[PDB]
Amino acid sequence: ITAVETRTIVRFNRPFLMIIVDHFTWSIFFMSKVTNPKQ
Amino acid sequence: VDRGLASANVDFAFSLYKQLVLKAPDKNVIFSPLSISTALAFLSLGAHNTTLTEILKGLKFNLTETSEAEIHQSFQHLLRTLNQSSDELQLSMGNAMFVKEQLSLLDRFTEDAKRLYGSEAFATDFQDSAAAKKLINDYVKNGTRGKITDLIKDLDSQTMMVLVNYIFFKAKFEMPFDPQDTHQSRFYLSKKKYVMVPMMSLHHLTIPYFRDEELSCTVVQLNYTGNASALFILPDQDKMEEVEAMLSQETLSRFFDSLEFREIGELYLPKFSISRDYNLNDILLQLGIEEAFTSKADLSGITGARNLAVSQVVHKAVLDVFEEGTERSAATALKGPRQ
């Protein structure tokens, strides 16, 4: 094991959004809010 | 007109999202705006007068700025790009109409459905409800590679027509998570409760990144093979409502414009599979699509008569996130009984 000092951690351990956007049309193929990954 | 079309699309998706969250706060939300609007646009080919203008205004199109031909041409051109398989990236979309056996349809509707939506057409014996269900569910199951098997739960013997859309997406991450880095970790539902989930992780990687101090959220884009990507938005704890209050094309554009390639020490993302299914009647009514659900429904561009209305709009979506990539599928069904 090793210890390192880092600038940025991104941790999806709380509710989050995902959005799938088409470049040309801005059509939203898909969108989700994950409030509970287990349900 | 392309910018007016783009504004409509985002507005529809976020208007829909806000209504879904309102109906079920704190629940998962999983849906495909394009699957829904494609089915409704397909339906509107056969709609007239108020029934037609309500549908297209409910999809947020402005008929003083974009014509019906321009709208349908937009769907046609988009749909022509959604059936490709390359470099571990799979995109599939199908549209179909399941029509009562021996029920005749207007030539312009069947021609238009084929030309603009690539619609397939099946004769269906709706009096045998079990067999008609299996037919439609099998069409969607095949199209979504087994992911959506029960789109149709109930089917009325008096059904005249069912319009169906499905979309299927499967990709590999450009930089996959190594499963030796997946560990059981806490996922905080809120201040009062957490849940244990398998947490994937990547170390020392450069990805598009933006920290929005005003919305208290972190935005990253994870890239798939085949030049696909996903925008992930991570609100600070108890700041989801703030981000949701700001969802708009302007905010989305600001996010994309603010992304920078940033070296990230660690990235944690849960491995998970969730699904939701919806009856969209209430929400579509809220969005202003009213006449199509009533006896006033003018769907006479389909059958030649005003003998058809929408009884139910159902939607199911599935999201699978795993070390190698992601799978997303959705399907929409519009059930139409005799009137």
UniProtKB/Swiss-Prot annotation, chain A:
N- and O-glycosylated. It is found in: Secreted. It comes from the Eukaryota. Plasma. Synthesized in the liver. Like the related alpha-1-antitrypsin, its concentration increases in the acute phase of inflammation or infection. Found in the amyloid plaques from the hippocampus of Alzheimer disease brains. Residues 1-6 are annotated as: O-glycosylated at one site. Belongs to the serpin family. Interacts with DNAJC1. Alpha-1-antichymotrypsin can bind DNA. Although its physiological function is unclear, it can inhibit neutrophil cathepsin G and mast cell chymase, both of which can convert angiotensin-1 to the active angiotensin-2. The reactive center loop (RCL) extends out from the body of the protein and directs binding to the target protease. The protease cleaves the serpin at the reactive site within the RCL, establishing a covalent linkage between the carboxyl group of the serpin reactive site and the serine hydroxyl of the protease. The resulting inactive serpin-protease complex is highly stable. This is Alpha-1-antichymotrypsin.
